[PDB]
Amino acid sequence: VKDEVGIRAQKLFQDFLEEFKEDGEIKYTRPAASLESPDRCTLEVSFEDVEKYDQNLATAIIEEYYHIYPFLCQSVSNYVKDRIGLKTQKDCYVAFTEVPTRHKVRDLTTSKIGTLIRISGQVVRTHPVHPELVSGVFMCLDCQTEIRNVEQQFKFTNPTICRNPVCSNRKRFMLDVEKSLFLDFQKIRIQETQAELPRGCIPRAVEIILRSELVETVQAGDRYDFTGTLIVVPDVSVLAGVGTRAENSSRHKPGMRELNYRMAFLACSVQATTARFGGTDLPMSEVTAEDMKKQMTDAEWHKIYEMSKDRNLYQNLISSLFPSIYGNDEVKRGILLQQFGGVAKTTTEKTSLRGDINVCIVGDPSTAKSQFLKQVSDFSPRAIYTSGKASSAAGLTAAVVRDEESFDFVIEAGALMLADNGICCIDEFDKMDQRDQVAIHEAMEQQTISIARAGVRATLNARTSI
Amino acid sequence: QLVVWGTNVVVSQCKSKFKSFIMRFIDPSAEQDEISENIDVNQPLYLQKLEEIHTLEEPYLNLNCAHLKTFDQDLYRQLICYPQEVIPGFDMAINEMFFERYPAALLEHQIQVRPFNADKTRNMRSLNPEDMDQLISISGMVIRSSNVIPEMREAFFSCNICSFSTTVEVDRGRINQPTLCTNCNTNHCFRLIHNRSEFTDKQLVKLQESPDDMAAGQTPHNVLLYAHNDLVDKVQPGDRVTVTGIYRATPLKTGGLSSSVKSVYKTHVDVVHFRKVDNKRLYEDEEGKDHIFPPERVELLQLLAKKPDIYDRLARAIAPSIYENDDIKKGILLQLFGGTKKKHATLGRQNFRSEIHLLLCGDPGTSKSQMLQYVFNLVPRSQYTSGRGSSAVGLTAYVTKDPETRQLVLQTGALVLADNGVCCIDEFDKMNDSTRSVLHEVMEQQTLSIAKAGIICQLNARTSILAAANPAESQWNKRKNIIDNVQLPHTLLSRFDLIFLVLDPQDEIFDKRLASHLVSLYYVTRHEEEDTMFDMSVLRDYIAYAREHLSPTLSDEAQQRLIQAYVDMRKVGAGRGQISAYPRQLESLIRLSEAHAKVRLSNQVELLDVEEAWRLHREALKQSAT
DNA sequence: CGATCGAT
DNA sequence: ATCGATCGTTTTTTTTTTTTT
Numbered sequence A: 001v002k003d004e005v006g007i008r009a010q011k012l013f014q015d016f017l018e019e020f021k022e023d024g025e026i027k028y029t030r031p032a033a034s035l036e037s038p039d040r041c042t043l044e045v046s047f048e049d050v051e052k053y054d055q056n057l058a059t060a061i062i063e064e065y066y067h068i069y070p071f072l073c074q075s076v077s078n079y080v081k082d083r084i085g086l087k088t089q090k091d092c093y094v095a096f097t098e099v100p101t102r103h104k105v106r107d108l109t110t111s112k113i114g115t116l117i118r119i120s121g122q123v124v125r126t127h128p129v130h131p132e133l134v135s136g137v138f139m140c141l142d143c144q145t146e147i148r149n150v151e152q153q154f155k156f157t158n159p160t161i162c163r164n165p166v167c168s169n170r171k172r173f174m175l176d177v178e179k180s181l182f183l184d185f186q187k188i189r190i191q192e193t194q195a196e197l198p199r200g201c202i203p204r205a206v207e208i209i210l211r212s213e214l215v216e217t218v219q220a221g222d223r224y225d226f227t228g229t230l231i232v233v234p235d236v237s238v239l240a241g242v243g244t245r246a247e248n249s250s251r252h253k254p255g256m257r258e259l260n261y262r263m264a265f266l267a268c269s270v271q272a273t274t275a276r277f278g279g280t281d282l283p284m285s286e287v288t289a290e291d292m293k294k295q296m297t298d299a300e301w302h303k304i305y306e307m308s309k310d311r312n313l314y315q316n317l318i319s320s321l322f323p324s325i326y327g328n329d330e331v332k333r334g335i336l337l338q339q340f341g342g343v344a345k346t347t348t349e350k351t352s353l354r355g356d357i358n359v360c361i362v363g364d365p366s367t368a369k370s371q372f373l374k375q376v377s378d379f380s381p382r383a384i385y386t387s388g389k390a391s392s393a394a395g396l397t398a399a400v401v402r403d404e405e406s407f408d409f410v411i412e413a414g415a416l417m418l419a420d421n422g423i424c425c426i427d428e429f430d431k432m433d434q435r436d437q438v439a440i441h442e443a444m445e446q447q448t449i450s451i452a453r454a455g456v457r458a459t460l461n462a463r464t465s466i
Numbered sequence B: 001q002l003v004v005w006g007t008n009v010v011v012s013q014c015k016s017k018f019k020s021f022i023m024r025f026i027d028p029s030a031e032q033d034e035i036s037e038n039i040d041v042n043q044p045l046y047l048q049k050l051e052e053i054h055t056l057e058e059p060y061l062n063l064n065c066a067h068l069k070t071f072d073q074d075l076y077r078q079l080i081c082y083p084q085e086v087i088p089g090f091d092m093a094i095n096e097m098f099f100e101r102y103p104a105a106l107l108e109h110q111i112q113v114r115p116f117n118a119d120k121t122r123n124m125r126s127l128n129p130e131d132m133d134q135l136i137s138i139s140g141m142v143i144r145s146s147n148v149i150p151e152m153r154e155a156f157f158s159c160n161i162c163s164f165s166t167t168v169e170v171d172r173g174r175i176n177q178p179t180l181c182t183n184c185n186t187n188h189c190f191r192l193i194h195n196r197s198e199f200t201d202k203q204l205v206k207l208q209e210s211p212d213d214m215a216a217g218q219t220p221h222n223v224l225l226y227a228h229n230d231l232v233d234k235v236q237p238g239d240r241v242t243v244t245g246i247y248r249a250t251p252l253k254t255g256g257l258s259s260s261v262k263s264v265y266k267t268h269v270d271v272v273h274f275r276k277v278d279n280k281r282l283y284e285d286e287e288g289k290d291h292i293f294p295p296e297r298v299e300l301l302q303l304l305a306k307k308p309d310i311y312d313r314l315a316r317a318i319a320p321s322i323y324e325n326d327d328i329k330k331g332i333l334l335q336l337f338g339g340t341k342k343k344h345a346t347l348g349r350q351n352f353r354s355e356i357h358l359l360l361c362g363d364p365g366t367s368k369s370q371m372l373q374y375v376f377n378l379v380p381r382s383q384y385t386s387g388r389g390s391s392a393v394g395l396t397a398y399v400t401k402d403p404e405t406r407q408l409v410l411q412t413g414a415l416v417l418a419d420n421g422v423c424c425i426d427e428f429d430k431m432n433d434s435t436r437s438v439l440h441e442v443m444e445q446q447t448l449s450i451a452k453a454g455i456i457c458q459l460n461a462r463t464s465i466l467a468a469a470n471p472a473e474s475q476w477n478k479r480k481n482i483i484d485n486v487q488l489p490h491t492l493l494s495r496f497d498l499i500f501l502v503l504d505p506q507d508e509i510f511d512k513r514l515a516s517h518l519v520s521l522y523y524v525t526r527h528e529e530e531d532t533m534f535d536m537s538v539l540r541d542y543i544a545y546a547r548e549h550l551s552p553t554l555s556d557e558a559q560q561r562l563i564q565a566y567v568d569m570r571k572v573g574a575g576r577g578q579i580s581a582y583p584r585q586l587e588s589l590i591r592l593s594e595a596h597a598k599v600r601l602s603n604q605v606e607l608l609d610v611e612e613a614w615r616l617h618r619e620a621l622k623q624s625a626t
Numbered sequence C: 001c002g003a004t005c006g007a008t
Numbered sequence D: 001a002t003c004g005a006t007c008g009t010t011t012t013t014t015t016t017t018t019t020t021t
């Protein structure tokens, strides 16, 4: 058998990181240790570390991956067995990283298969969860049906010959959805790189699939880093492929399916970068590893006490975010209170009580009232800005449709409307038409709003200030 | 005594005669034929080219049959009728030619052979039965660039007992198997899997016939082609390209529920070779790596920089022949040398690009549309749209169905392809308010954040203007300034940096000079490299190279003049319904300044740029003293 | 064009 | 078990009216 070298390779990789892996420590045992209780079966592995200890299995890896891939799961099980009293429930999801090379939609051939390469793009026209019971139990009809075998191939075939008997070899048993092997994925599409925008041809799009742990964490407007698992796609039927056709005409001595395969692509790693914020228990650049209410929520108390104690820090902070700016010193102290919290009471079922406050700017022309806020989109989280006429009243509403795509009437979102606990300010409040204006007339105060003419029980809500 | 069944060929004849022909070769196809010429090579071009290519070690030759005319055309004809039987022998001759070149060379990376040049057949319209296995070559216009597809010749196999894990490939369409693969005793049945096996790429695209070689007043009936590995996406759409191939006929399946077969064989051409035809006259694209210049050109570039005449030279080299009142072409040239890069990777704050924004506006007399139709044949990111060519969504979100996915997709735009570029634009006062409230967003923030039911985006978009706006009038009305003549608001009209005004030249006289000279320009249909020394490309890298290695910096020079004179520059508070001076002007002044220091390549500040800036201003800021 | 089904 | 004679087998379309904002 071919990949027994890969077996021993990741075996003794385990056996090394069974000892230390990094400075008397291991980076992929405590993830596995957290795994041991629920047994969720996802562990990313550094690709650098193959070159560290295994001495360039990368080229042993990055071509015959698709065939080698399954053996990594057996390797995973062999890892978990060594110290845990183990059953073979264990599985292998991977979310690979620490990989250098970054190729795009153009270097595509028959020669690109079984790799781990990292690739980006865009996210469009997403699509939902759609499960899969890939496996089950199936053989002849009478008694000899206990079948946890390898029957989980994409091309699925109930028909199996026999295990114990001479019995039916096309008449199958019935099915198992109870104690067998199942899993999940979804399916979405991707457009050409906006970092690679040439002329001429279209945005050639790729098909894409996601395993368990990858799921519902892709999203429109985001670039990525995939695996390089380009496929032979177990397709079923297609037209225009009028090449030569073949099939095994067996030995002469004294079923058919037309063959035209198409392409798609699969991936088992993501770093949805440019879309990552982190609240306060994330250790930042400047921290103080201390004890606190939570991990890093205020473990820099060692200074934040000081930044909460001075009678000077009021004015200093008023001057600690307008270094490049000079004007009055009243909005320079008031505007932060818009970003600063409100009331946050703990009280009755009377009605929603609000924390936020309305806020304004007026001024004569060319006073850099814009530059106050041009940065604020770059500043706060949740709080991205554009203008109101920067879109239509498909800013407040969605784009009103009168053609059939899914159920022929869709207004279920907007542009103001997705600013939950961030502000999406606007400019030019004087010449804008009196539609969103009277919408805001109550949408700011009574943050619980409705529409008609296309309503799926229309009840939406504003959340922030202005 | 050996030849294929339905043929009259023999392979040793063709290979031997081609080998003798290349040996009987001193580049005679243009050293004996073009004997007036003499390539200084009294050696075959072919062993010379195996040297040129194995010294380069970048394989994949090409041939042409004009070389192969002078030899006995028995090779030529029996390559015509049997090209699938005579082509690869040329590659075998190449295989021995390696040995002629080098014995131990890379004798495993293989060479193409791409002949052509018998003649145009005629054109697509007029074909016959007999031209089915022959040599054809026409061209026209392109439709598409479609996606690529593998194609097998083999499978992968498996087993249960001892793991008979094997393969076997295809001849073309007929395969064998035991009850196993590598069968011994038949311990199981045959296991076949379909992935870990042999594949080949190829792809098909559709192609037209549309030069003016038309059945005139007829739509061009179009052709079709496949592709093969080394010719796959050899061309992108909207090109005219030559074809070299062999006609290829194919049945159609009657019905489909059964295996019946229809009378009409469909025909296409296979692929040997094509001729991608390039026409990029204007100032070329922006890869950066594939454009680097030599030091010898840097000599001439800094030579150009060594002229104080350079302040006017390139502005004078803007027009091909136009010699009236170019006094703005200096103001053009600050965008020719398209702006400075005052980056904001420094503080993370306030992101003030050296935004350069100027438009031309005036009467119809000025050749704004035609000048700038030619300047479309200058600008690297040349665009040309205008009022009522495309809507706001005609600039962005070209969203609709895609039968490639069998689904609809979120899709394309216009401006984000033209970052840093220009679109020559006219008829500005033509659009709905839907557009032109986008331009406020970009002209004032140079941004975009988008929200639709599908994808929601915060992209990046940013570039500089050219435009050729017009009024609601035919002539700019005397005693009614463009302060209101062109159709815009009260101080948004004032908002622009400065639009260097245009208008008809109010002087009857000067018509005759150029009505005669620049008609004689046509009458001769050529130019002269007079004092207007039109550089072939010596102008074009001072354009190109001077976007990148330059970083204007301010020490003390080009700032302080209006930093004094702002007293009366902001005594402007007085005025009834007017528009006046504002403290955005100097931003534009610094930007102009670093721009004009781009010319002269002054890494530190230029001071004269202020003086031409003040000139630029007060030549066209006193157009409304009223 | 496929599976059923009968006998040799 | 083997062969042969038995059984049963079918798929193709694009566009016009009133309605709602």
Ligand SMILES: Nc1ncnc2c1ncn2[C@@H]1O[C@H](COP(=O)(O)OP(=O)(O)O)[C@@H](O)[C@H]1O
Residues within 6 Å of the ligand: A324, A325, A326, A327, A364, A365, A366, A367, A368, A369, A370, A371, B583, B584
């Ligand atoms: N105190 C200041 N700090 C920084 N920039 C300023 C200040 N005062 C004025 N400016 C400049 O003045 C310009 C004001 O233009 P802006 O007010 O945005 O135009 P509008 O009046 O149309 O909003 C800005 O570009 C800004 O850089």
Ligand SMILES: Nc1ncnc2c1ncn2[C@@H]1O[C@H](COP(=O)(O)OP(=O)(O)O)[C@@H](O)[C@H]1O
Residues within 6 Å of the ligand: B322, B323, B324, B363, B364, B365, B366, B367, B368, B369, B370, B426, B468
């Ligand atoms: N210097 C020049 N060189 C060549 N053509 C000129 C020149 N000056 C004027 N023209 C002519 O004037 C006409 C200008 O019309 P055009 O600019 O296209 O109208 P609009 O101003 O609406 O764009 C063109 O047809 C052009 O041939």
